[PDB]
């Protein structure tokens, strides 16, 4: 009878106390941890958080729970009586909300081996917080942080350690709307220092990269095409005043309605981004071309024999249709090499 | 931790509420229905509706706050002549020692009780064993909406009340003779409820070999007001089409005048249609509003096309096209309106 | 000790029963109610409800709790044993959801005086429902209802009364994004009649007024400037067909851009509103400005005594210079006098 | 009196233990499962999940509960004492939140026959994870997975099996806006392999197809009409500079507002979809429609003068048929590689 | 056994009462409080509230919990037996909702020293309300507070005091998408006065500045360039009627697109903000530029003395080339001094 055997090791006949850690007044207890990510995503920049579903496994030793007469190698414990076994008080430092799972039964499992080793596996969901920097918004690399650290136990009592092999595992076939979760992860020690003492921690880091493919075909390329329509006015005779005025205008309007309407897609950020610099400079080129026609229209009418003022109007257009693509190419090769490389 | 018959000596219940029911609850099994292995019990159900709204087309659901009352007869709860008062009140923390029917809503997604200051549940027991239970709920039923004729559509929302584990041979549900569903004075943002709720007959469920199961059904009918769409969406689109016909009276030599008139009418209709994409519901199929918007765009598109016809015939009279199109574009647009209405009404 | 002294009054030795109202088979008990409002807001038209955070106080006299032997008065009850005493059954008829508070302890308090008076104060949050009418959406007044109701007691057993002074109090410093909360409250009796009997009810009414600052400068003034720009065409030269056609087809395009763009900020309401009349009529004025030019264009062009055609063409523009601004002033007089004053 | 019979079945006097599976130290337990679906919807692209309301039914055999003296076969068990019966520890693998139903009572039922068969029916709601890809967004077919698996039992103790007939059923009259749920469903075995053993699991697949009614009439047909409108310029006389330039630049502006305004109803992703390629090529066609006129305008009046005029006239004649033919070639290749995959 | 020693202290033989405050009928209880902030954000003007996740610590004294026989200096108490120790009835005045954290165990700790000192540390997630003023929306300073009341104890019973060092601490690396949290904080007393008595409270204040780097490059600079484009028409010839009219009316269309496009990215209020004043008068400048040409064209059309009207029409364009920039420069002086000084 496994239920009868556990009552002997745990009942009032035994001297087991659930509020006393193993190896009392002695060496600290080792705890080995494992993480298995099932779900990942829901990354939002408004609240700077992301939701993760994991399997958490803890292993330690307890010399008080040692048996030799029972034939079975391992004994399972009823989840409704889990409060009568000492357990480490693990919790997440950047945790902003968490739940247990009771879909049909309790999703908890505790198993006691013959030599006193205890295995403890639970399935929980978390809402962890990560700070995000969107300065280089399309070409951004973010880092997500997972911390597992104690509540009221110092170095002298409880020490956390990652597993030797297969510490962090992720299920295959996980996709994100915006990011790529890289297969390389970092396992680093953290150790908080306070006035009360020194506390244990372990850290796991993930790296994320954006697709960047959609922003090229949707807002970079159409912005590049519009400023080409700005330069076509230099190949039209200036006697057709409504032609060049009506083309210089409605190109700024096209650029304005390209910047506007993207406000819903772009995240709500109160500082400048990489995309904002591109849209402002592209508006500056289509604006500066309309002033070029005002310089050549006013000079031509100033003349009204030598007739050299008309040739002066030619020199404004001849220079401008070569200098405008050259100064745009200089900015373009300056923009990409300092925001990508 | 309570029992129907437990050893406890208390002298303080003396013809009080606590003194009388303990004599009633001796050898009373709450897991046994009244008239066991005999005549099935009958329930009289009435519903009072407090709040109605939050009708959503994204998830196809709506939230209702109700008062639910059921009545039946229990011959095991005879009230003798010893107790003078007719009715008794059962303390709400101890319903576990009384038999109640297992009612549930078939199309229910989420529900909860109300405990704002006390539990909003009471139970009465009469002299002849009649039991009355009244309670307050907040259910979230599911309403499948069909938005094919979106600007002018009629939706029928449904409420069902079944028994979870009792067949028709044991438990039956009945509407009250008078006033089964009652209404209040509330308003709705988009729809308009009607005071003609048909209490549909009992839609008794038949399952594969388990047996018949009782259910009662009440139907609400909703109608959508067309005031906003007729003046905000329909009337502006009608005016731009008239401006597309404006270029027929302009001289054909005005190439710099008819061309911007014909291309800015297309831009106005294009901007108007795409501005409403963020306001109308998303159903990803053709609605009645979308047919109007695409057919109006064709009339604006065809106005500019015919000018290219008359512009190339001159440099190759040829003004008969503009004379013919003056009495053709409004004449063909009138038949579309007669076709578009008297179909959707 | 007050703990053992209270158990004498309410324990199994005493005949006190929590299921019997005070003054059984006698006059009904009277309850005095007070409400202190902490926070107010979250007013939404898509769900037609608002959220409050209130303090609720009730006072009633229980002769069975009178004591005349303790040296001290005003005994305090622990919230754990709060179900051992009789309390009135109160609920809000407008409630769509509510909860208590357990921020650090239980936010409840009960006090029992020497003569038998009972004081009961709790802190709760409510989601109350109020119908709304947006027929005059920019300039409108709304009234919100807070009802207090007895569940299962009639006039023969329970009676609810407002406090004599300071019945409803609002904490200073409350702000709302779109509404102004009036300082004038109304206290009324709204007793409900049923087939079972009469039931107690007391209500408090709040008046809300919507500010005109944002809508007047963003959607009313720019609409007025656009229709003035449509009247510029009456002064342009008659033979300038490309100039007069472009000024009037862009003005319609400008007007529909503003009307459709501002519609996203509007509440989702399927019937007509006050500004919907304004936007439709002001659109009709721009539409009529372009239509009259064709009457000018067709009359003058006809047949290339032919001087009557030119004379009749100028007569339309001369009349329209004064008829169009005059009829728009009539519309402004009628609109602002029937939606206000 | 069926209630007192349970104490003779299990209890202190009986040897029945809820912590031991039936047929201990023997063959594994066969479990037969059925699923009835009541609701289906809320297909969320951002959170990669969907919601479902199901009925779950499990059947197995317990030899310890056999009886022969009690007359009738059926014997129901009260839901308040459901923890005294051994039950399988079923749970959903791709589960992101679930709950039971307590609308008036517990929505559970347990039935025991004479031989020992146990029937267990519950009603739950699920929020299941469904990864999806929108590489070809308007023409896509997606698969939804629902997995049921054990938590702490291997092949040697617990085996899950689908029902022979009526394994998965869907309630009649079910609809959802975006997708169409096909009647064909697949029932497969996906046994999990770990370092501790093999764990049983069964899965059901649903196939979803999107409707093309709204996208073809809103985003494809209006995009096709604007491109045809840009070909009007090849028929206008080349001396009408304000007419041809004004028509060309307005079509570019019309295309930009069509693309920018339609992003509100599209899902938010960061990779290129099939609808983006259609909009990018359509923008490229109207971009080249105006640019060829600059070649026409510059070749004309460059300086025998009829030789240069004939050179400019052949550009419009060639492009009169080259532009519609090129667009037809792209249109064939677009639908072949997408609608037939 | 540490647990056995605490049973004697909490036993009924010890006579400890949880309802009786320490130092009964004597001096009031003085409590020291600390706050450590883990996360900050979710600032919303729609509901006038923000979220926070803090560590709260309280220290007081209790002469009844004095021991000298046990060698250990501190004795820990399990979270399940927290009802056996008197605790202050602290609560937050301006909170809307709160909850504890139970991710793996209870996130509560209590320690008892030898001299009766008691420490009590918990982890709380809070939603706190704060009124906001958006009359200067592009550049404004907001203040958010935090109050710690006593529910049922007056000044002669319970007094709250801040710690003299390290009262409020904020974890490093916190960021917000809109505001910037300043380093300095204010600690002050805001004790309440009521008719029942005087109640203790303590406060902490945070100052936030909204960085306006995004609003300058997206809303102010593009609005400045559009106004400058309207002044180009004063340099174009007055005979070019389609050129000047087409430029004038399209500039208003561009300005209206800029205003309506930015409407969806601003908070929903009903009063006039500082951004609304800038956008309104920039529309007034481009509207006044179009009326300038109407006066020029109407005067020059008279009597088509011959050079008298041409000189008058030329003099209007001559003075408008310098009147418009100086008027706009004067307004920009008054705008950027009022909202900055
Ligand atoms: O006295 C303290 C305050 C301090 O608060 C910041 C957060 C901390 C994380 N955990 C939570 C409990 C705490 C602790 C344990 C045992 C005695 C005192 C004590 N704390 C907090 C402390 C740190 C360290 C530790
Ligand atoms: O065996 C079953 C399966 C079937 O599932 C579809 C839903 C149903 C609604 N209720 C829920 C429980 C059920 C029932 C009651 C008593 C024995 C078996 C049993 N069920 C379900 C059944 C129907 C009918 C009934
Ligand atoms: O019989 C009824 C139905 C009716 O339902 C509408 C709501 C009401 C508010 N409370 C809740 C319980 C009720 C009541 C009390 C005692 C006996 C019958 C009874 N009710 C409801 C009743 C009213 C009045 C009262
Ligand atoms: O040791 C483990 C870790 C591993 O974690 C991934 C998830 C799993 C699903 N269930 C949950 C509990 C588990 C299990 C049961 C009995 C002993 C060890 C044990 N686990 C997890 C395991 C798999 C398999 C099984
Ligand atoms: O009698 C009252 C009403 C008053 O309500 C406003 C809020 C207050 C904050 N706390 C909550 C309980 C209260 C209090 C304590 C002890 C006796 C009476 C009593 N109250 C409220 C009071 C204030 C002060 C205090
Ligand atoms: C693991 O346990 C051993 C002995 O119990 C001791 O070194 C210490 O407590 C732990 N070691 C580490 C490195 O944590
Ligand atoms: C209670 O009622 C019974 C009759 O039902 C009566 O005989 C008795 O006197 C009453 N009072 C007490 C204290 O029992
Ligand atoms: C319920 O339905 C049954 C048949 O399914 C019918 O005999 C009975 O009369 C119905 N009860 C009503 C309509 O009240
Ligand atoms: C309650 O108030 C009414 C109103 O006058 C009074 O008649 C009644 O006696 C009061 N109740 C008690 C118990 O005094
Ligand atoms: C359960 O099914 C397996 C697969 O057929 C079978 O081998 C086994 O015998 C079954 N269990 C019992 C108890 O018969
Ligand atoms: C603060 O409270 C302690 C606890 O009783 C008391 O001893 C001390 O005198 C108080 N300090 C004051 C009132 O300044």
Swiss-Prot record, chains A, C, E:
General remark: Highly sensitive to activation by taurine despite the presence of Val in position 135. In mammals, Val-103 causes a drastic loss of taurine efficacy. The alpha subunit binds strychnine.
Intervals, Cytoplasmic compartment: 237-241
Principal cellular location given in the protein's record: membrane
Annotated protein name in UniProt: Glycine receptor subunit alphaZ1
Originating organism: Danio rerio (Zebrafish)
Gene: glra1
Protein residues bound to strychnine: 194-199
Transmembrane segments: 215-236, 242-262, 274-294, 319-339
Glycosylation, residue list: 30
């Amino acid at each position: 009878p496994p239920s009868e055997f556990l009552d002997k090791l745990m009942g009032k006949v035994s001297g087991y106390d659930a509020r006393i850690r193993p190896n009392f007044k002695g060496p600290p207890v080792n705890v080995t941890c494992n993480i298995f990510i099932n779900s990942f995503g829901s990354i939002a920049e408004t609240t700077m958080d992301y939701r993760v579903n994991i399997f958490l496994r803890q292993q330690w030793n307890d010399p008080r729970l040692a048996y030799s007469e029972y034939p079975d190698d391992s004994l399972d414990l009823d989840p409704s009586m889990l409060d009568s076994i000492w357990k480490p008080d693990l919790f997440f430092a950047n945790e902003k909300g968490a739940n247990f799972h009771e879909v049909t039964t309790d999703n908890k499992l505790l198993r006691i081996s013959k030599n006193g080793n205890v295995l403890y596996s639970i399935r929980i969901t978390l809402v962890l917080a990560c700070p995000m920097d969107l300065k280089n918004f399309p070409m951004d690399v973010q880092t997500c942080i997972m911390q597992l650290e104690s509540f009221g136990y110092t170095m002298n009592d409880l020490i956390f350690e990652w597993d030797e092999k297969g510490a962090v595992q992720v299920a295959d076939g996980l996709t994100l709307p915006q990011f790529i979760l890289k297969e390389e992860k970092d396992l680093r020690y953290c150790t908080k220092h306070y006035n009360t003492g020194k506390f244990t921690c372990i850290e796991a880091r993930f790296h994320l990269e954006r697709q960047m493919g959609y922003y090229l075909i949707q807002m970079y390329i159409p912005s590049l095409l519009i400023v080409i329509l700005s330069w076509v006015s230099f190949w039209i005779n200036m006697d057709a005043a409504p032609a060049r005025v009506g083309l210089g205008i409605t190109t700024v309007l096209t650029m304005t309605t390209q910047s506007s309407g993207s406000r819903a897609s772009l995240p709500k950020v109160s500082y400048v981004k990489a995309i904002d610099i591109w849209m402002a400079v592209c508006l500056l080129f289509v604006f500066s071309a309309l002033l070029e026609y005002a310089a050549v229209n006013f000079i031509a009418r100033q003349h009204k024999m030598r007739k050299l003022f008309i040739s002066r109007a030619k020199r404004i257009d001849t220079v401008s249709r070569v200098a405008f693509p050259l100064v745009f190419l200089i900015f373009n090769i300056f923009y990409w090499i300092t925001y990508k490389i | 931790p309570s029992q129907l018959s437990s050893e406890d000596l208390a002298r303080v219940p003396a013809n009080s509420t606590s003194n009388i029911l303990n004599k009633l609850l001796i050898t009373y099994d709450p897991r046994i229905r009244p008239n066991f292995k005999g005549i099935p019990v009958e329930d009289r159900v009435n519903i009072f509706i407090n709040s109605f709204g939050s009708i959503q087309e994204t998830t196809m659901d709506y939230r209702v706050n109700i008062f639910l009352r059921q009545r039946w007869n229990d011959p095991r709860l005879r009230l003798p002549q010893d107790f003078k008062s007719d009715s008794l009140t059962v303390d709400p923390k101890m319903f576990k020692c009384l038999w109640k029917p297992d009612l549930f809503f078939a199309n229910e997604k989420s529900a909860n009780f109300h405990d704002v200051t006390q539990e909003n549940i009471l139970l009465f027991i009469f002299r002849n064993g009649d039991v009355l239970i009244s309670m307050r709920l907040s259910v979230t039923l599911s309403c499948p909406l069909d938005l094919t004729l979106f600007p002018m559509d009629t939706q029928r929302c449904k409420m069902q009340l079944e028994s979870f584990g009792y067949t028709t041979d044991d438990l039956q549900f009945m509407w009250q003779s008078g006033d089964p569903v009652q209404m209040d004075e509330i308003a709705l943002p988009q729809f308009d409820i009607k005071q003609e709720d048909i209490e549909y007959g009992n839609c008794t469920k038949y399952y594969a070999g388990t047996g018949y199961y009782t259910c009662v059904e009440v139907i609400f009918t909703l109608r959508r007001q067309v005031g906003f769409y007729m003046m905000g969406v329909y009337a502006p689109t009608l005016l731009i089409v008239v401006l597309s016909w404006l270029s027929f009276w302009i001289n054909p030599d005005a190439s710099a005048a008819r061309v911007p008139l014909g291309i800015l009418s297309v831009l106005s209709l294009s901007s108007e249609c795409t501005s409403l994409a963020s306001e109308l519901p998303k159903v990803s199929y053709v609605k009645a509003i979308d047919i109007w918007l695409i057919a109006c765009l064709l009339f604006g598109f065809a106005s500019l096309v015919e000018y290219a016809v008359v512009q190339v015939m001159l440099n190759s009279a040829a003004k008969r096209i503009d004379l013919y199109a003056r009495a053709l574009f409004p004449f063909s647009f009138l038949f579309f309106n007669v076709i578009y209405w008297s179909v959707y009404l």
